[PDB]
């Protein structure tokens, strides 16, 4: 017998029983999953056959209380009772959860399916040992739940903060896998830091895996780790203004390491975004082909710059932002949308479900749109987005905002983060996409993110005004500025340059 | 909140959600038939979605609670106490019903579904407050489930060898008007003792474009209590057959010229449709489908039943209906039964299509046929005659008769008169006897109409058995007889002694 | 290096790649075969089948069995093969002879006697052997079409050709092929029998083939429980006592399958000789009927039951050796008889095929020693007991004590026993007669004598019908009697009928 307080719900395996593969049994599988992780254990399908049902939950009862392990039936609340179960979980559109405390009496774990806000303060409005854990809506797409982001995920943290249910468990759940986890795992955590996932639930993944206790030793890897390092520059927290050295050494970098810079967009942006890269003596290359992608990752320092309202398919941009994750190359995120028409929003948040992100770049609507909300503002906006996104992320105006929000790729269960949206680093500063795209690109092993990314915005910025002097209007002043771009590299002297760099 | 003792299960109204008509609710189809008769009602749900289920079966209570009905739920045992349902039905493959018992506590009243006696033999290790009520398994077949009377017979009978005085009945499956009252009528405990308490519709209410008008069908047929399932007489006649009366048999169905439907064999065709024409009635042998109902139609027809015959149960099937919807007399004498396998399985089919007013079998086929020396063979054809509520033949060195018509009585849960009381006296076959049903007026009597015809037929044997040369003019000699006896009707005359069994 | 006559052809195996069983392969199935009988013929890229050749005559090699090739003539020449296997659509066999050279062994398809004819006016060293025809149907592509074609072998001198039967060869009908299967003069038979599917896609092939073995190197095919000795000396009035009162005692079942004018009037005989009739034609039923002490099958012909069925009871009967008695309201009376009844005689053995001077000549494949020669013919073309019916009634008796060998093959169509059976000037009533006769005999009955004694049975009946009768009507029912009256007092030394030799 087991209390609310003993429950681990690290690893959550959830089975399903028409699944299994040819010449395996579900205790089986659910025997290897405990060998080598899963915290906790849900029985539920029929093939129903409510009898047939008891005589497989004593049988696995047995085998988790074995390694001492809780087991959680769904939804069956009288089955969970009849077999002296160890909890229940429901979903949304099951007994309503007074009730179900009446029938179970205190002590017994209650599991519900929660996927937005709104049911989050109804959960609240019921007090303790009404709602103990929830399961946070479908992650990400699958087949395994017969009719039916990490975005999506916060703003269910968030409620849970916001009216303090401090006695309500979370675990995430839906389209998990090794591709995935890390990722989830880094980004699911409230906005004030103080909250992340409890653990992650998975079927597939080990149900229907033809070595269950290999796929198992996998997520353990995974889920008790605490770095994700998610692309091979730093990430270390830097607090001290970019110095003008430093700039030096970046330019430097990047135009030794001759970065190959993919461009994926429209039009208007192809031509104008090859001559940035050009000048800024690396190569741009304009492949939307699904076959290529993967082998053009694979080129030494390969950075991957996204525009959006594109002609590719959200079947080809999934498969890029994952190849260059998979090889922990970089990716900069600069929205032509974002959220400028229905469509656009859509797309948008879609790619954001899809990899993480080294950098994420908008104007000030692109930011608070993205922050889901002056100049005080367009700094707390800019944060946000940063923390939101575990990402660096620029804000574009007179003065350019940036704002370090990968807190070093640390991830921790329900802790989360040690730092809040409010408290990370953001400086400011008086073609930017695919500028940023080649200073990260030229990034060495030891190189800096963040450093990089503001070096970027300086060198534009500073362009920006020698071009703005040296032209006759909008024709020569696109074409000077690639020019300074050009003149101001080919000498690194940023003791030069315009642009002012304070702190925010 | 009922008890157990206060479940009237008489009319019991199952609901089936994915089979409503268009337009039409189920609070609609439940409310019409609570306004008339539906005792009791059960509600189910397989494919939704948990919480729907809990609202529908709360809008429901309050309706049945409003006409006084209980409402019992299955299989989800969790909703049943959730909602304070009155009770919950369980399947042979659901929760084991001691776990049951022990979640919702005494009370409840708990239904199981039992097919087979060894089913009532497991309800019986359990004792009372266990199982409260049963569902006998499907007596016909349905499209409803997704996965006959004598075999509900079987169970009512272990129900009594383990005195489960505390376990009510209803039947279930294929329940239609066109079957009600016969399945009322033969469904009772060998020893008369217990009946079905109730019957169980789905489809016939739930389906229906008028459940109104449905329902009040259904009610009329419950509560009832003859079945008058052939236009003779049916009293009990404790006076051996009369002379008297043997002439007048033979002399209504000389006037009455019976049309003799034969459904046989290829050797029985020719040498029955002698038989019939030598008793003054004309044979017909068609065994074609649309012919039937016209047939049966033809005053004072008759349908003669074989086995093994080239014919598809599909049309045996509409025959036997197509003469009980005009109450005509039905005979039946298996040429198998229980001779093979194959025979075996098509008989028993047969038994469940309708009523019969004779059945005809030598030792082995009437041994058979109560499910089993000379004072055997006695207890065997009463057992047939109870059985299947008819008269019942057994031939041999004697000819056995017995009546289990009872008057054509039935009602719910009584049942009754055993095996062991009803009359039984003691004295080709098939056709005589087919004639002699076949000509009696409404006023007239099934049993002594049937033992005329074995006395007849055992009269016309001993004077062709003496005027004969061997087998071939035997056959011959037989048929004369038979024409000669009858042209006379002077049953004082007769060689056969008729004595009481 | 083998040469023609060291070529023994007893059990051979065909092989056919794409019909083997998952797990198992041809090298695995072939071996299996090897080790419990089988001469073996191969039958994708021809590069791959090369391989596989070599690969498999190392196998026969090994086991000192010849190795032979089909279709391709240059992979045999290629592979130093012992010999090739041609259809009829394949190269003529003049060109293979002059590509192969003699030595090699030639083997040829075979299924009509036209093509004995060609393959005899090309003498020997040109075809060797002959696989005769599709005998039963399969799908992996009867006895009397063999017949005809080891007929042809004869009647041509073609000494120098052996020959296999193919086709649809099972246990369940390997010994009635290899005991019907026999030149009209008796002096030729199969040499022995071709399987493919029956090892090939077995799953345990070991053990398929030593059943088959079993069977080859048997001489005994005894198909139904009760005597086939031959007799030569005449029925004795004891004996055809002794028939009589074991048919009364044991109350032999007897199914008919007829049309519905026979229906009645063979139940009343089969009533009349003390045993109990059944005019069942449902499928299920027949292997439960069949299993019924003393159980027996009566067919008749232009019936309303499906082949299927027919084939069904046929066997059902065979295969617990229970005798069946064919008498053909057909037969060869129309085209689709004539069609079905040949269709009819390949389901298994018959005790008794009774047929009239037309159905007899038919059969025979075709006065008074005319009717006796054909009579003769008939028994021992279907290896059973054959009844002529006419003014004299014919028997005679080709069961040969139920011999069968390979090549050898027995007893010529001449030289069985027949004898006669007359009364004077007086039909499916006779059918249900002998049914009833042979139904009744023990396993130290005889089959001969009882068909006898049934033929004399009736055949008295008759003249005694015929005299206490006013016309056809009472004629019928008289006969029915006189079958009572005559078995009720078995005293044979009074009854009219005159039983010769022939
Ligand atoms: C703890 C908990 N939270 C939510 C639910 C509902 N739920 C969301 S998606 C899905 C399966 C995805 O598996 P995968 O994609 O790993 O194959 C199910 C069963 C539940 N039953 N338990
Ligand atoms: C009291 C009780 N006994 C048995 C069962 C199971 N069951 C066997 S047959 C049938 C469908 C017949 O519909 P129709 O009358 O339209 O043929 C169902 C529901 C149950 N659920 N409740
Ligand atoms: C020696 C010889 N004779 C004839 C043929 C032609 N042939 C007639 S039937 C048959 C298949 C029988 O398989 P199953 O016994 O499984 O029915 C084949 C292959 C040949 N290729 N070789
Ligand atoms: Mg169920
Ligand atoms: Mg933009
Ligand atoms: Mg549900
Ligand atoms: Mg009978
Ligand atoms: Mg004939």
Known sequence: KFSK???DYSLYLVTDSGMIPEGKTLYGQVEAGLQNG??????????????????????IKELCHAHNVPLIINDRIDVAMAIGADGIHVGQDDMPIPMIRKLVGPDMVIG???????????????????????????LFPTLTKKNPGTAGAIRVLDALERNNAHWCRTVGIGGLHP?????????????????????????????????????????????????YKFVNIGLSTKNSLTTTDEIQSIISNTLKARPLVQHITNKVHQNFGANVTLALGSSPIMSEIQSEVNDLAAIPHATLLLNTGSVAPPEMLKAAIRAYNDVKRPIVFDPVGYSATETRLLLNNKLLTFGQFSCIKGNSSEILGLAELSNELLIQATKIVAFKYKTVAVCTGEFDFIADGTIEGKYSLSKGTNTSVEDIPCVAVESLGSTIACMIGGQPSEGNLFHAVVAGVMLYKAAGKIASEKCNGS??????????????????????????????
């Open 179 to 227: 591709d995935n986890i890390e990722r989830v795992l880094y980004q699911c955590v409230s906005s004030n830091g103080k909250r992340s996932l409890d653990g992650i639930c998975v079927v597939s993944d080990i149900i229907a895996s033809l070595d269950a206790a290999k796929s198992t030793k996998i997520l353990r890897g995974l889920i008790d780790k605490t770095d």
């Open 5 to 7: 307080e003993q429950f």
């Open 112 to 138: 519900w399916s929660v996927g937005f806000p709104e049911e989050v303060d109804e959960l609240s409005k019921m007090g303790p040992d009404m709602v103990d854990y929830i399961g946070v809506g479908t």
């Open 475 to 504: 024709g020569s002043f696109q074409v000077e500025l690639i020019d300074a771009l050009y003149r101001l590299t080919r000498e690194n002297t940023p003791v030069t340059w315009a642009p002012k760099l304070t702190h925010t």
């Open 38 to 59: 899963v915290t906790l254990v849900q029985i539920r399908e029929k093939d129903a056959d409510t009898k047939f049902f008891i005589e497989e939950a004593l049988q």
